[PDB]
Amino acid sequence: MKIIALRSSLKLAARIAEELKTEPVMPDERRFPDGELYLRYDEDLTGHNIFIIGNTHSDAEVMEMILTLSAIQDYRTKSVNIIAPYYGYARQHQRYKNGEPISSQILTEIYSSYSNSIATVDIHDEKTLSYSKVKFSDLHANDAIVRYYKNVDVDYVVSPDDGGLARVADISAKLGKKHFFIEKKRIDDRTVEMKVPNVDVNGKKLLIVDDIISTGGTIAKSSGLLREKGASKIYVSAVHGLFVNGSENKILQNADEIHVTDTVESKFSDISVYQEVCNYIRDI
Amino acid sequence: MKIIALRSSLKLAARIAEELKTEPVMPDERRFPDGELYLRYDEDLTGHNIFIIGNTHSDAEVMEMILTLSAIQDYRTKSVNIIAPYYGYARQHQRYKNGEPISSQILTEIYSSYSNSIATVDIHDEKTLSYSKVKFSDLHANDAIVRYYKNVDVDYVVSPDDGGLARVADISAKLGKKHFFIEKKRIDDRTVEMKVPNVDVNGKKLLIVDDIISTGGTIAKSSGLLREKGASKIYVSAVHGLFVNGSENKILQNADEIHVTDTVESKFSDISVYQEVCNYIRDIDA
Numbered sequence A: 001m002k003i004i005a006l007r008s009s010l011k012l013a014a015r016i017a018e019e020l021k022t023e024p025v026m027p028d029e030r031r032f033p034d035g036e037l038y039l040r041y042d043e044d045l046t047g048h049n050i051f052i053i054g055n056t057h058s059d060a061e062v063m064e065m066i067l068t069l070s071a072i073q074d075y076r077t078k079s080v081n082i083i084a085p086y087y088g089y090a091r092q093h094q095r096y097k098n099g100e101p102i103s104s105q106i107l108t109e110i111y112s113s114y115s116n117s118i119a120t121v122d123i124h125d126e127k128t129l130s131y132s133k134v135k136f137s138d139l140h141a142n143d144a145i146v147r148y149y150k151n152v153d154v155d156y157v158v159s160p161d162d163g164g165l166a167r168v169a170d171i172s173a174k175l176g177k178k179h180f181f182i183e184k185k186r187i188d189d190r191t192v193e194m195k196v197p198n199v200d201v202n203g204k205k206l207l208i209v210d211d212i213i214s215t216g217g218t219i220a221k222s223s224g225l226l227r228e229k230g231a232s233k234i235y236v237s238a239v240h241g242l243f244v245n246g247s248e249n250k251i252l253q254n255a256d257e258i259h260v261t262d263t264v265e266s267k268f269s270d271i272s273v274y275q276e277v278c279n280y281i282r283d284i
Numbered sequence B: 001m002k003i004i005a006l007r008s009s010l011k012l013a014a015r016i017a018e019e020l021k022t023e024p025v026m027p028d029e030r031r032f033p034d035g036e037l038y039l040r041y042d043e044d045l046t047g048h049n050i051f052i053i054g055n056t057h058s059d060a061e062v063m064e065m066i067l068t069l070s071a072i073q074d075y076r077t078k079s080v081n082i083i084a085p086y087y088g089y090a091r092q093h094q095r096y097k098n099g100e101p102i103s104s105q106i107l108t109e110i111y112s113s114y115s116n117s118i119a120t121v122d123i124h125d126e127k128t129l130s131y132s133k134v135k136f137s138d139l140h141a142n143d144a145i146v147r148y149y150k151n152v153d154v155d156y157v158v159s160p161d162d163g164g165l166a167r168v169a170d171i172s173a174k175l176g177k178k179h180f181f182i183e184k185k186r187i188d189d190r191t192v193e194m195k196v197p198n199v200d201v202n203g204k205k206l207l208i209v210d211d212i213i214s215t216g217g218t219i220a221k222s223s224g225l226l227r228e229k230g231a232s233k234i235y236v237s238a239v240h241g242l243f244v245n246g247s248e249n250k251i252l253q254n255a256d257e258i259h260v261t262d263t264v265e266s267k268f269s270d271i272s273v274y275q276e277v278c279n280y281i282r283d284i285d286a
């Protein structure tokens, strides 16, 4: 097998390659003076199953993935398999107003045209998997998150909204903990929040889990609500830590700690999903 | 017909739309907090021939084109026709080393998959045309450049290297002028230049023409050479004025004026290709 490690995913891809006892093949990569992207893979990938590892979220990341898909065509490879730890544009998986792109659709179509398989970790909404002509697998960071928190004192696992439920139910089951979610709504400028079930959080230690942290607004608000109700400790976890200015400070206003995975590498990437990806590769 | 004017081509697209008595339809466009691109075309495009005008060279331009090609699928259109006044990645039209992308190939395949036709103005190397499943037309700024310089005192039209020869031959003939080209080559750290034919440029007014000005090294050097040999005026034109790294100033050290087209809009964009694109649009109909 050959593991290609793209710029966005050097850390995770390296962890993966080492575990698999194989080279993390990186491109030679630079920008031409006019700003166009240049890539080169001088290693002979002929006859190998190739696993390209890189996020598909920024303009640059998309260009890096597309041009990689072209570069590898120089070789008669056994198969080409895309693994995008964080899959970009998953949030635009339908048209929400007329004349909008279904961004995740056209992009998945493109990737699927040039590969034999696609996989990502905890895609936002699985609708997008249906846009691929090749098998598109949704991998899960659950076990890695459970591994981390087995050595932490936790009373409840909590979803910040009424949508992150399945993940929180699975994670809590594996930790042997109870769980609940927070339903937040705005009714005429004023905010209303319901705990379901209506758990007493007074003096309790809470692990809040979500899939993505962007602006952090969603998790920051719920953390503040729970702190207000007497939570003794709040841990914040997400799979994909984007942390756009200035999410970390909003969250840490009321939460004690932030721990995300290495799908998107940051100072808070304390939980690696390498094992989950290796399983997929081993079986693919 | 509906003309869609993308961010990179607002000036040219607007000129085209106005010439054709139609709206230059712009997207509502913005970046989400995480940096992902949002576009929206609220106009009803159903039943129309659509012409999407935008360059395809920057990362953002590529995303703009791709997401536009998805957004317009919300409507039952008659046809979708891409016009990229400047076509990105045309310079990488083969693998020059093992394991390089053929960037112009994969990108052309993508655009072709979501359109009924593609056009650009003066592609760098027509090899890339063959990468498209749909008809990929190479329009030319020649007549526009001619129309500008028929009112300029010019003695010779000149190619900066021995490759943009057909264009310079066509332009000089339409101006009723002679032409030559400069062969520059490096031989053991020294640079050797030959004029072909070996024209005496002393006291002569020269129009240098290329397809793209990027770093402008070749043109700046040639201008210096020609100036040293006694040229009285040097005009520099190119279809695509990218102007990276101070190139325009490097060139103006020895050239008198720079005039480029509006394929890439800058303060040097004095020659519009709107008529050439309108003629193409008229042919494809609507």
Ligand SMILES: Nc1ncnc2c1ncn2[C@@H]1O[C@H](COP(=O)(O)CP(=O)(O)OP(=O)(O)O)[C@@H](O)[C@H]1O
Pocket: A089, A091, A092, A096, A124, A125, A163, B032, B033, B034, B036
């Ligand atoms: N990268 C991004 N960042 C922020 N918002 C985005 C985004 N991409 C798309 N969006 C917007 O986010 C909104 C998502 O719609 P919502 O109704 O809030 C959730 P949904 O997509 O219906 O269900 P889901 O979140 O369970 O998949 C849309 O308006 C979409 O345009």
Ligand SMILES: Nc1ncnc2c1ncn2[C@@H]1O[C@H](COP(=O)(O)CP(=O)(O)OP(=O)(O)O)[C@@H](O)[C@H]1O
Pocket: A032, A033, A034, A036, B089, B091, B092, B096, B124, B125, B163
């Ligand atoms: N945007 C860009 N800017 C600068 N150089 C680029 C580029 N994209 C690709 N290149 C490089 O430019 C080189 C072009 O190859 P050359 O041998 O100089 C001319 P050619 O492409 O063979 O003929 P042509 O210029 O007549 O098309 C390649 O090494 C390619 O990798």
